[PDB]
């Protein structure tokens, strides 16, 4: 009944197309896949997809703490190169570049699915760690007329609506319009967040074998919020005076500004010719823009990073411990992305062996025009952490003695051909597939007049086996590969070769056909080779041949034991380490915790005086982690508790509607989410309380 591209009946999804690009039951997928449903999201009312993943195993949602500027993730100890997202929407990648990275609001999603480990065999170039694939809402079967009001701490105000219906009797034409407007203050003083998004959609079904769904998304964010750096001195450890910087501290200029604009049009098309062939096609064109005027910190004056800062030097050595150095960046980017994935799915048998053959052509073009300016060492006055003074900063005064321009035009293109077969004999299922990619990149420096290019040709494949016992328990194992081009240039003035990803995984999945439960467990060995590292000569350039190894255990469970009880919980153990690095051999990558775990549960009363009342609570534990690649310090572990109070408005004469109270970080725990270096730390989110009223007419 449930479709991999539609809504899931409960908190536990059983269908998914991220792992195979075919509507496949999760037990028959030889890889780890997590699915966060719109229903689960409604439980926590997240502002970003990143927050919605707070309970998902093998995924770290704290690389920026409370900031939701980007949905940047670390999956199984890995992230894309250059601090870029690695997100997909409806099976096509939202290829971003530099600061130009698109973001989709959770209110517009039907699902948020996480794919752990290599996936190039189906998607092309990608980080070894995995990818995020969001699935847009689509026109509903029955009518939908929802209006939602939100009000919470830090002056958060949100109003949204979701409408869907047919325009004719037979249901040949249906539409769906979703929108929201949100204004709120950032956790840190002086910063604000604003978002206005609308998502028009239409589905045309000339016949029962043909579906054409138009999908568009328009979003404007005059202000995306805070995105600065705080030093470890004042966050993880106290300042020389034994005090810490408040969680709402802001080291940026008072006139800092960060904005983003997103425009997307595209469609999803499928047609079944007969029981043997089905054609499927997804395409999207995106034009995203982003601008910022940002003064950010760069750590205290005693920090190695500020070795030769004429401003830090002119300070009493005793004073270097509470003065924070800062820099600025004026950015302005424009990006266009065009993507098309066309598939042919064939179902046929060879004896007792049933087949599902997938062959497709997948390609994308992307260009990003960057016109920025960067301030160097003494480009912005020091900030006295003992007596912080927030003032306007003149971004126009581009002093050539301490700042320079940065105008680049990056172009990327990738075309790939892939084939996959899911052959099943009795209770055995074998997933085999391969993909060949042509990935070309070109970077033109407008200032220098230079131009760097590189054409890559990589082949990747994946094989695995699933055994389906007639009881729901189905063990499995698989081997998958991936590749990730570099954009770095070396001594010889050439772009390096792409690093690679190789993973071995064994696990078990329990999915009973009688009960709505899903439980998964997995053990894996992921390794990234040809990673870039420091030069053994020390020529300010980077060398190849580096290697990082990640291995761990993940177990996730989600299920509605009954009509009044839902349960979600997960556990993650991840041991990442540099196995070959001229500088960090033996260390563990920063921002990567060894242990994580979460448990959530909600109960609903159908009788007694509490009827129509839903109560929930959960906790999320994040192990400790290293604050830099040199492992010179650690970020303490932390535990956060969430709560929920929903009240079905059926008792008062309004079925389908409800009012709720959401609480994140119930005990207002004050913690440092993570640091990527001594001068780059982030406070976690302080307690948040949201009042929600969603009405359906």
């Amino acid at each position: 009944q449930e479709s991999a591209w539609g809504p899931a009946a409960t908190i536990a999804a059983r269908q998914s197309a991220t792992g195979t690009k075919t509507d496949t039951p999760i037990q028959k997928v030889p890889q780890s896949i997590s699915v966060v449903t719109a229903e689960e999201m409604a439980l926590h009312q997240p502002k970003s997809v990143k927050e919605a993943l707070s309970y998902t195993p093998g995924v770290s949602v704290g690389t920026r703490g409370a900031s939701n500027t980007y949905d940047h993730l670390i999956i199984r100890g890995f992230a894309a190169e250059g601090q870029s997202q690695n997100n997909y929407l409806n099976g096509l990648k939202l290829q971003g570049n530099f600061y130009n990275d698109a973001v989709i609001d959770p209110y517009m999603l039907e699902r948020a699915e996480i794919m752990r480990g290599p996936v190039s065999v189906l998607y092309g170039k990608s980080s070894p760690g995995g990818l995020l694939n969001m699935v847009s809402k689509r026109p509903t079967t029955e009518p939908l007329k929802e209006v939602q009001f939100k009000a919470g701490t830090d002056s958060l105000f949100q109003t949204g609506f979701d409408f869907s219906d047919s325009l004719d009797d037979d249901g040949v034409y249906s539409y769906r319009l979703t929108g929201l407007a949100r204004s709120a203050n950032a956790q840190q003083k002086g910063s604000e967040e604003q978002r206005y998004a609308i998502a028009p959609a239409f589905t045309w079904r000339p016949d029962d074998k043909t579906n054409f769904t138009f999908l568009s998304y328009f979003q404007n964010e005059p202000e995306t919020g805070y995105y600065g750096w705080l030093p470890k001195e004042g966050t993880v450890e106290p300042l020389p005076n034994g005090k810490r910087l408040p969680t709402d501290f802001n080291e940026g200029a008072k006139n800092n500004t960060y904005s983003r604009n997103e425009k997307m049009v595209g469609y999803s098309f499928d047609h079944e010719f007969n029981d043997t062939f089905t054609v499927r096609q997804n395409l999207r064109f995106a034009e995203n823009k982003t601008s910022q005027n940002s003064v950010y910190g760069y750590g205290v004056c005693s920090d190695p990073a500020n070795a030769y800062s004429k401003q830090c030097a002119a300070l009493a050595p005793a004073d270097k411990g509470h003065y924070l150095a800062r820099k600025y960046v004026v950015d302005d980017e424009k990006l266009q992305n065009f993507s098309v994935d066309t598939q042919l799915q064939s179902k046929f048998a060879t004896g007792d062996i049933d087949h599902t053959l997938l062959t497709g052509v997948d390609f994308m073009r992307m260009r990003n025009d960057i016109n920025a300016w960067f301030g160097y060492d003494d480009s912005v006055p020091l900030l006295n952490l003992y007596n912080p003074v927030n003032t306007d900063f003149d971004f126009n005064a581009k002093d050539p003695a301490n700042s320079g321009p940065y105008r680049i035009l990056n172009k990327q293109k990738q075309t790939g051909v892939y084939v996959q077969d899911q052959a099943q004999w009795d209770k055995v299922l074998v997933t085999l597939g391969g993909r060949y990619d042509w990935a070309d990149q070109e970077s033109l420096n407008r200032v220098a007049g230079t131009t760097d290019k590189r054409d890559d040709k990589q082949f990747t494949w994946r094989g695995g086996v699933n055994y389906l016992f007639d009881n729901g328990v189905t063990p499995y194992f698989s081997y998958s590969e991936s590749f990730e081009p570099s954009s770095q240039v070396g001594k010889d003035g050439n772009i390096f070769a792409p690093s690679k990803g190789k993973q071995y995984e064994v696990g078990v999945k329990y999915v009973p056909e009688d009960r709505p439960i899903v439980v998964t467990g997995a053990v894996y060995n992921l390794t990234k080779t040809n990673n870039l590292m420091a030069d053994p000569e020390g020529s300010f350039f980077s060398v190849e041949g580096g290697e990082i190894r990640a291995r761990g255990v993940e177990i996730e469970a989600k299920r509605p034991l009954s009509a009044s009880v839902n349960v979600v919980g997960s556990y993650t153990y991840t041991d990442a380490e540099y196995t070959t690095d001229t500088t960090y051999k033996g260390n563990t990558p920063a921002q990567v915790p060894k242990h994580m775990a979460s448990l959530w549960a909600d109960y609903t009363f159908f009788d007694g005086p509490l009827s129509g009342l839903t109560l929930g609570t959960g906790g999320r534990y994040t192990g400790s982690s290293y604050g830099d690649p040199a492992n010179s310090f650690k970020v303490g572990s932390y535990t956060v508790v969430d709560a929920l109070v929903r009240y079905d408005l059926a008792r008062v004469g309004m079925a389908g509607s409800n009012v709720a109270l959401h609480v994140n970080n119930l005990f207002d725990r004050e913690y440092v989410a993570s640091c990527f270096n001594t001068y780059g730390c982030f406070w976690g989110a302080e307690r948040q309380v949201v009042a929600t009223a969603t009405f359906r007419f």
Partner: peptide, 6 residues
């Protein structure tokens, strides 16, 4: 700072 190195 665009980021690996910064």
């Amino acid at each position: 700072a665009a980021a690996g190195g910064g």
